Design a protein around this ligand. Structure first.
Ligand SMILES: [Zn+2]
Lengths: 51, 158, 97, 91, 121, 192, 54
RNA sequence: GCGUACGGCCAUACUACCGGGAAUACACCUGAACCCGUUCGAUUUCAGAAGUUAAGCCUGGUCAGGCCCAGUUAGUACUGAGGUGGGCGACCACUUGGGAACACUGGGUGCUGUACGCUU
RNA sequence: AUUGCUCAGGCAGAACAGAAAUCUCCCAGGGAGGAGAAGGCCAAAGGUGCUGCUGAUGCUGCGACUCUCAGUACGAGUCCGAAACGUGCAAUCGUGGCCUAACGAUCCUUUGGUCAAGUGUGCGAAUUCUGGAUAUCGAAGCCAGAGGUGUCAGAAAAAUUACCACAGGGAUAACUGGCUUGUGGCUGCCAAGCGUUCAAAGCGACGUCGCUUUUUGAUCCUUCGAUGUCGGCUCUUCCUAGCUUCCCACCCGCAGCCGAGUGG
RNA sequence: UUGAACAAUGGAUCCUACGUGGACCAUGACUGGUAAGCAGUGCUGGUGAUGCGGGGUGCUCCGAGAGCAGACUUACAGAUCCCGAGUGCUGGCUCAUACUCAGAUCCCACAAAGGAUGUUGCUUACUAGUGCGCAGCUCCGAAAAUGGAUGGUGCCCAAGUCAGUGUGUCUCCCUUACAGUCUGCCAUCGAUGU
RNA sequence: GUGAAUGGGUGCGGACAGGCAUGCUUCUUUGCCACGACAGGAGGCUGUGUAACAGCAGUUCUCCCCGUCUUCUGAGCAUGUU
RNA sequence: GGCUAGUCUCUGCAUGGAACGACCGGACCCGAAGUCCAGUGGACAGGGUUUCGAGUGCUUGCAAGGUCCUUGGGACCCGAAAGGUGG
């Protein structure tokens, strides 16, 4: 147990009664995966322009 | 031996020499160690601080770390079927500059000065081999070698 | 074993951050609160049938406690809590004796 | 009941089945443990490192420094050379 | 020095001696195989040229010459050679267990290893 | 009897473990090439076609772009003995020749939207039989969720991901295996 | 010998000679620079010999 | 041929006894207003230069004690490997290698670096 | 930590004062001291007096290591970085004891810190109790200690069974047998003495070499899916370390008798 | 002189399923014990896991290591016969009236102190003789219980014992292991061309 | 007070060795200016080949000296060259 | 790509080791200077560390099958003396 599962055998942290997870659900993306989500017709007609 | 202390079975080991007691001299402190240097880890019992373990008593390591009063040394230690690179932090009273590479460095400097200046003959250090035939005039006359008579008195002198 | 009544030591408190006078007091264990979470759990487990539930201690090998000392900084009134070794008797040094 | 506990009998054999080697001998050793002043100084040195092109032109300038003296003296010696060769002929 | 201090310590398992020119020749021409290409090949002049041409050695006479009179390339020749397999000798051994000086058949037979090789080829 | 040295067993792999007959056809082609052209590239491709599937790992158009980013590789063909999948993070690709065992729909579209070509290994064998101007790239076998767990977490220095079967705690403070041997508060913490 | 006294004396002579090495190391560095100059000259002379014989 | 200061190695340098010491010194040496320290200006601190090599220091001697060196002990003791060697054993011899120690004999009794001087 | 000094013991000397009080001089490599067991270490000192101090937890959720070792922890210890300090002219030395022993997991509790408050002579600088807030109410959390597991990698713990049972064990006792024979039993060698004189007719002290299994040990090799465990009776056979008979043996401190010893 | 020798199909990087975790034997390296086929250790090798030749027999000794066959040769060790191989060759020594027949290859299957005018040699003191001794064999010391064991027979200028010798050469130096050499086949692991 | 035999650690080079020039640093140093300014003379010199050193080639040459200007601390890590 | 049976440069995958003047989150220390506003004074920001993470540094994923295994299950098969519930 010491060698293959260190953190076994203990108790740590604030315990949260009635842990709601729907108000904590928050999938994250990144800026690297934004311009894939724009039809590149817009990405082209908006390149240097103001829109 | 039913006591494995840090200094167990070190009566003869950590004893100073006959008429060699006293703390180390200034030649021990004026030595200079650089990283990569080879050093004999040799415990000095007159200084009870920074001592290495008795298991690195005649081990030659290489310097990896230089602290103000001590030096870090990497010594190989056979555990059972491995070798581990033990790191010791040992003061410089318990370590000596190792001459284990002295002959090699002498030979290398010799060969390089040879090939730089054009004098010398570039040691290659073969073993001591068989000899050639000689004719050996040798005035000296041979002494009769042979067994001698047994004398109980001359054997059991009293 | 004696220990001074005061001791100049480093107070790691925002006002001081340096060596202060640090009056010395022994550490007395406080009354166990009956409303601590573990005590409440132990009570909820003890009540009912089944007898004793947690293991009591009987062996009692030690004859000495480690001595704990609260040094209170005379300026911050911040308490540094140090420990010394296993000693049978202990008293703050009345330095005349 | 009563056992024969300790023995070091087959241990060299088991230990020598495969060669007794150090795992990482050519590998570098971590910088953790190295003295803090030396680690900070390595960091700051590398920060201050110039680039290879700047270094090349620096070395070029250093070589060009003593050139007017060197080329002049060398050409003077090279001029005096054939007299030396013709004197060495007469030997 | 290096080889003799090993021969000493393994002497209870080996004999050794100083072979004659014709014994060397018989060994080479009747028992010699090449340790080449991780195989055990019968020596031929072409195999000798391939494995040792680098050293101006082209024929079996070169091998015999270096072996008998060491020459510069004894090391390369001997490495090229595969350890000779010899039959159990005719006549036989006096006694494996003693030394040659003790009447046995171990240690150094300085010249009486020709008598042994001759029985073993 | 003889005090033997170790009898030679060739470490290298010389039979495709792949069950795809067309991977076997490619192994046949590149056996032919590694024999009767005998270039280091052909021998490498033969090795990699032998490789099992763990060892010809997927590779991304981002790795293709990183390989060919240098101006030296204007006409080179990026060769991956692997499935090629698209890095959505990569937006602007250059015209690239890329040979592989399979191109995902996304990777194929991203490479053919930049004017590049998606080559199979037979096309590569007919274009560059010696594999000249071919940039071999492999794909990374670390970063696997198995490789991360290899070793022991309770060994100091080994930062192995503990094996958690199906138990993904929601409270990351009250996680599984995080207390005794994971904080010096609990009498010790596994060393780094 | 192998005495502690003999070994300590050999170490003290070693340290003496390392000190003298460091003491004459600047002069040695000058000499070695000139030696590398002569090695450069020798190499280039060999190169010229080869290029003229070819 | 030496002196002083700082040393390195730390007795071939120490210990005892008997002698000698040119110069520079070093040293002993003279006093207590101050700095300073003491039970006591003994040590120590300060301030000096009348005297002396008496001692310290240097140096010469000793079949001195010690220390060091060489020989010798001694191929003795011991010992790795080997034997279907011996022996009831105890243990010993042999083959192939390695190889001391005390004692005894005799000889010796610091070398030297940096700086400043003396001797000129 | 600075600094001064030199210890055990001894010669010699000084009123009471002596073996031993205190004082003085010389000698003294440590024969003292350093808390304790032993070992190592140490002399203008890892000793000791005086004095000054508190570095006896080097700010942290703070490092690399070493012994142990699975190269895990605890523990112990070495080496560093830099805050703040002690001492010192300073270099330095100092984060306990000159060094090798002197000690302790989860969970729980407790205290300190965090927080909160306070300061803030203007700003900040923040853990939680989930429908949103408040409350030096309470509770939880994280961090550092402490309360102990000595069976000391850490269950909470009395006996009896001849009324007994089960799974096993010849890993393991009690009976035979095996090895050894200390003990027991039986013989040897030497010769101080006894024997009226005379070491042996007969003994044989002090010493010492053996033998047997034949007592008791010692062991634990076979047997615990059982080899029926003492003695006696019955019946056979064998050994000789010979009691009787035989050689009417040889020898005597053998006249006879009765005997002693030795041999087959 | 690419700056010691020899060897080396190898170095690096990993993953992973098991069995084992009663050991025992041998050796002046030993410790406890009077000792033990006792108990505990050290180095190495063996047994376990291992058959084969020899030791009569024997898990551990000596030789050697094991695919199926053919030929040759040997190891240890052997040749009176049992039992393959000389009642070999050349010098000695020993004769033992028992119930231990004298003695008869390691382990190992025991022997001691002491004694002998048996015998063979040698040293040595005395002036051929007399003393001390010292080695080889032999004899006594030498006693257990079913009848029995150099393995049996038996052996006696041995078939005991100590040496030498069998030489690419020998009137007689030969025997043979699953070992060495050569060959064929089987299988394995490889190399090369495909 | 000595001290074996047997042992144990380390080292024995590239064709990565060895040498040379330069850079950076908040680390170290009194050791910076300076990656700066100035600078003379002597020379059958240097290398390959040789015990006859003849011969052959000339490369920012050899020496005073890696000079002087108060005279230029190391360490670690790099950039080049051989 | 030059070049040459001397042999130079550029590319640098995978893997292993080291590093980071990098960055994300946590923990320290000196600070909180500076910029800014969806303005209850709040949001970040700077420089340093012997710092930690199952961190990132061009996402190494999912599903099915198969092999050897693990743990719960009768759990390779057989095997207690026992304990309990109801008769
Ligand atoms: Zn305070």
């Amino acid at each position: 147990m010491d060698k293959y599962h260190p953190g076994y055998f203990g108790k740590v942290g604030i315990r949260r009664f009635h842990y709601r997870l729907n108000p904590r659900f928050c999938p994250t993306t990144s800026i690297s995966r934004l311009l894939r989500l724009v039809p590149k017709e817009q990405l082209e007609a908006c390149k240097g322009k103001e829109e | 031996p039913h006591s494995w202390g840090k200094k167990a079975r070190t009566r003869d080991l950590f004893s100073k020499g006959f008429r060699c007691h006293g703390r180390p001299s200034l030649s021990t402190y004026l030595a200079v160690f650089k990283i990569g240097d080879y050093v004999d880890v040799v415990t000095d019992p007159s200084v009870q601080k920074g001592q290495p373990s008795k298991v690195f008593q005649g081990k030659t390591g290489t310097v990896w770390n230089v602290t103000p009063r001590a030096v870090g040394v990497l010594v190989n230690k056979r555990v059972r079927g491995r070798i581990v690179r033990k790191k010791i932090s040992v003061r410089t009273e318990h370590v000596r500059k190792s001459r284990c590479q002295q002959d090699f460095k002498e030979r290398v400097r010799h060969n390089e000065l040879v090939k730089r200046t054009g004098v010398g003959k570039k040691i290659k250090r073969q073993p001591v081999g068989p000899r050639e035939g000689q004719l050996l005039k040798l005035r000296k006359k041979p002494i009769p070698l042979g067994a001698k008579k047994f004398v109980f008195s001359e054997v059991y002198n009293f | 074993v004696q220990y001074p009544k005061t001791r100049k030591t480093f107070c790691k408190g925002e006002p001081c951050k340096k060596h202060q006078t640090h009056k010395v007091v022994q550490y007395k264990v406080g009354k166990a609160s009956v409303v601590a979470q573990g005590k409440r759990r132990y009570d909820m487990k003890q009540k009912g049938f089944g007898g004793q539930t947690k293991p009591v201690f009987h062996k009692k090998a030690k004859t000495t406690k480690k001595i704990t000392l609260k040094l209170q900084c005379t300026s911050c009134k911040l308490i540094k809590q140090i420990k010394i070794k296993r000693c049978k008797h202990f008293e703050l040094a009345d330095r005349k004796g | 009941a009563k056992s024969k506990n300790h023995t070091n009998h087959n241990q060299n054999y088991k230990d020598h089945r495969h060669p007794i080697r150090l795992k990482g001998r050519r590998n570098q050793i971590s910088s953790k443990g190295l003295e803090q002043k030396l680690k900070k100084n390595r960091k700051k040195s590398r920060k201050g490192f110039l680039t290879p092109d700047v270094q090349k032109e620096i070395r070029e300038k250093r070589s060009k420094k003593g050139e007017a003296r060197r080329l002049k003296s060398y050409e003077k010696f090279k001029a005096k050379l054939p007299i030396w060769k013709a004197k060495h002929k007469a030997a | 020095a290096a080889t003799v201090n090993m021969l000493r310590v393994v002497s209870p398992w080996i004999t050794w001696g100083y072979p004659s020119h014709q014994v060397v020749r018989n060994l080479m021409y009747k028992r010699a195989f090449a340790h080449f290409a991780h195989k055990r090949l019968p020596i031929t002049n072409q195999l000798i040229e391939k494995a040792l041409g680098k050293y101006k050695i082209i024929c079996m006479e070169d091998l015999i010459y270096q072996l008998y009179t060491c020459g510069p390339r004894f090391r390369e020749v001997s490495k090229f050679l595969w350890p000779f397999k010899l039959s159990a000798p005719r006549g036989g051994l006096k006694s494996k267990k003693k030394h040659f000086i003790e009447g046995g058949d171990s240690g150094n037979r300085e010249i009486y290893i020709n008598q042994l090789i001759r029985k073993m080829i | 009897g003889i005090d033997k040295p170790k009898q030679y067993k060739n470490k290298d792999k010389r039979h495709p473990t792949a069950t795809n007959p067309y991977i076997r056809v490619l192994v046949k082609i590149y056996r032919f090439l590694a024999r009767r052209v005998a270039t280091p590239f052909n021998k490498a491709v033969l090795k990699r076609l032998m490789k099992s599937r763990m060892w010809r790992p997927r590779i991304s158009t981002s790795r293709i772009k990183l390989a060919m980013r240098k101006p030296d590789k204007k006409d080179h063909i990026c060769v991956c003995v692997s499935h090629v999948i698209h890095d959505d993070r990569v937006l602007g690709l250059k015209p690239l020749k890329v040979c592989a065992l399979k191109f995902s729909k996304g990777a194929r579209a991203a490479i053919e939207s930049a004017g590049g070509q998606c080559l199979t290994f037979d096309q590569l064998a007919m274009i560059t039989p010696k594999g000249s101007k071919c940039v071999l790239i492999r794909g990374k076998v670390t970063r696997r969720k198995q490789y991360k767990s290899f070793g022991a977490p309770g060994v100091p220095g080994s930062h192995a991901v503990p094996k958690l079967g199906n138990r993904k705690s929601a409270l990351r403070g009250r996680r599984h295996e995080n207390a005794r041997g994971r904080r010096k508060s609990r009498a010790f913490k596994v060393k780094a | 010998n192998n005495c502690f006294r003999r070994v300590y004396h050999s170490n003290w002579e070693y340290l003496l000679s390392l000190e003298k090495e460091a003491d004459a190391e600047p002069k040695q560095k000058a000499l070695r620079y000139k030696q590398e100059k002569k090695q450069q000259f020798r190499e280039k002379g060999l190169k010229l010999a080869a290029a003229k014989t070819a």
